[PDB]
């Protein structure tokens, strides 16, 4: 399971999931709702996958956790136009994440 030293990451992820712009990213991108996603996006990521990975001990370090967070936002900007609803949400969430991360990494 998760080491207590990563509790700050668990909290950041909880706060991300609660954010008004998080709704696109809560669960894996759903083939029932959009086609051609995994054709393009070779490493899908979403907050529920991260939540389960963190809780089971699948992140040994905070850097591995942060890499998956950034993968959510990198995938979003690779697939979606910047002015689309999901594209805009990804930019909001990246800023929110990076602002929280910078409290710890400075
Ligand atoms: C392609 C993409 O990057 C997307 C991401 C990260 N999310 C979503 C999305 C949209 S609507 C929804 N849910 C989740 C589950 N609950 C119902 C609503 N997820 C997309 C598809 C965008 C567009 C093609 C509709
Ligand atoms: C239910 C669902 O599967 C959905 C699919 C495929 N797309 C969208 C979507 C994208 S953007 C937008 N709007 C609505 C009108 N006002 C705000 C912008 N709805 C949804 C609703 C999901 C909900 C979590 C927001």
Numbering used by the authors: 1794 to 1899
Which passages does the manuscript contain on this structure?
BAZ2A is an epigenetic regulator affecting transcription of ribosomal RNA. It is overexpressed in aggressive and recurrent prostate cancer, promoting cellular migration. BAZ2A, however, features a shallow pocket, making it one of the least druggable bromodomains.
The IC50 values for the isoamyl derivative 79 and the bicyclic tetrahydroisoindol-4-one analogs 80 and 81 are 3 times lower than that measured for 47. Crystallographic structures of compounds 77–80 show almost superimposable poses for the five inhibitors. Extensive contacts with Leu1826 and Val1827 are formed by the bulkier substituents of compounds 78–79.
